[PDB]
């Protein structure tokens, strides 16, 4: 059997970076070399593991998390980064084991008026713990006076237009999970 990675990368609508979707990958085999070899991706970096050895390895599960961000925001999907997406949207652990893959989505996700359906969180009382997801839509109180002065809605929009640093970039995070349980996703052996 093959890991249905196609379901992830070639899906029609990706999540918004605040409600980032997660798919679990199990009981399958993946040609990881199909992924990295493609010039399609404007980013391919893995942390905690060399991609070539991915094919030699077994993992208890693999998690595919996908969302859309701005190109010049990509630098953040990486351990130890800071920023809106790093702090208020998607947080990778300091010690990561996975791969971060990104491509420009302007042809699909930019509209002429701006595509306002891709959203992000701009304010939060505190930062995300790694792999935490916050869809809370309650008013953010930025002022001493209770909103019940400096009161804001946490979620902004990207409003994507064919302007690349502000262009839509779809992102996939593959985290490689090892448990004391039988590995069910392995490379080609």
């Amino acid at each position, epitope marked *: 059997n093959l890991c249905p990675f196609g379901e992830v990368f070639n899906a029609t609508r990706f999540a918004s970076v605040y409600a980032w979707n997660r798919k679990r990958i199990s009981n399958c085999v993946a040609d990881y070399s199909v992924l990295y070899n*493609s010039a399609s*991706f404007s980013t391919f970096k893995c942390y905690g593991v060399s991609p070539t050895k991915l094919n030699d390895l077994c993992f208890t599960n693999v998690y595919a998390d996908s969302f859309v961000i701005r190109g010049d925001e990509v*630098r953040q999907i990486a351990p130890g980064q800071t920023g809106n997406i790093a702090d208020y949207n998607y947080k990778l652990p300091d010690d990561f084991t996975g791969c971060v893959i990104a491509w420009n989505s302007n042809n699909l996700d930019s509209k002429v008026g701006g595509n306002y359906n891709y959203l992000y969180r701009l304010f939060r009382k505190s930062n995300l713990k790694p792999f935490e997801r916050d869809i809370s839509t309650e008013i953010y109180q930025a002022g001493s006076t209770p909103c019940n002065f400096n009161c804001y809605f946490p979620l902004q929009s990207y409003g994507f237009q064919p302007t690349v640093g502000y262009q839509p970039y779809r992102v996939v995070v593959l985290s490689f999970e090892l448990l004391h349980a039988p590995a069910t996703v392995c490379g080609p052996k």
Partner: antibody
Framework: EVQLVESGGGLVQPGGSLRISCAAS????????MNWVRQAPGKGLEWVAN????????YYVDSVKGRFTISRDNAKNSLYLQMNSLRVEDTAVYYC????????????WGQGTLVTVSS | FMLTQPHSVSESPGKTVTISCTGS????????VQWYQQRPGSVPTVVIY?????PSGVPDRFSGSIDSSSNSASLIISGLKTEDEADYYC?????????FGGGTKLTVLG
């Protein structure tokens, strides 16, 4: 040990065409991305083009576009670079190299061939 | 997207040198960064690949680091020797093109 052997460098007039090859021995040349990267005298490395393992896609640097065509024969374990409409700026020792993976190192290189373009 | 390197860097034998490869118009830590040594009149050979991995048979003195904050990947040689005197190149790959640094001429004083 593995030697990457190139041939075909020489003198060509401006507007002329030259064809160069890299032939492999000691490695499977099939499963990898193949690339041409040149270096003019007293100058630095400049990537020139590359080609997918099965030949599906070919990519070139802007200044050679339309002028160079890169091809490969996996049966001969050979890489090819047709250079057309040649210009003076192209004068360089042309190295062939194989990247281990698409974003990784060039683990194997050729000894280099020089193309000179002038009168 | 482009890469800039210091034109020249010098440090004494037995010390440690860092050769920087800082990115213009892009993010260097978006994709892996690879390092290539070229001794006079010889073909480039790998010294560092995948930002910080070291090939077998390359001297142990060569390390690598990456700094997304300063937009730079770095090539480090612990405990320098005179034989390290060569030109050094960094490279990385944007989605359609392989991209090389200008090159660094390392000098070993004294």
């Amino acid at each position: 040990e593995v030697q990457l052997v190139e041939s075909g460098g020489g003198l060509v007039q401006p507007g002329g065409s030259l064809r160069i090859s890299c032939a492999a021995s000691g490695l499977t040349f099939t499963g990898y991305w193949m690339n041409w990267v040149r270096q003019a005298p007293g100058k630095g490395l400049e990537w020139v083009a590359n080609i997918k393992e099965d030949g599906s896609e070919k990519y070139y640097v802007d200044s050679v576009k339309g002028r160079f065509t890169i091809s490969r024969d996996n049966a001969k374990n050979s890489l090819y670079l047709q250079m057309n409409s040649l210009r003076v700026e192209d004068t360089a020792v042309y190295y062939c190299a194989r990247l281990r993976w698409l974003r990784g190192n060039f683990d194997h290189w050729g000894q280099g061939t020089l193309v000179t373009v002038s009168s | 997207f482009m890469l800039t390197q210091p034109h020249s860097v010098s440090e004494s034998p037995g010390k440690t040198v860092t050769i920087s490869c800082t990115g213009s118009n892009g993010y260097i830590a978006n994709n892996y960064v690879q390092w290539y040594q070229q001794r006079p009149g010889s073909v480039p050979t790998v010294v560092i690949y995948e930002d910080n991995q070291r090939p077998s048979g390359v001297p142990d003195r060569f390390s690598g680091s990456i700094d997304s904050s300063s937009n730079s990947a770095s090539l480090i040689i612990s405990g320098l020797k005179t034989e390290d005197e060569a030109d050094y190149y960094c490279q990385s790959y944007d989605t359609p093109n392989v991209v090389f640094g200008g090159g660094t001429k390392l000098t070993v004083l004294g």
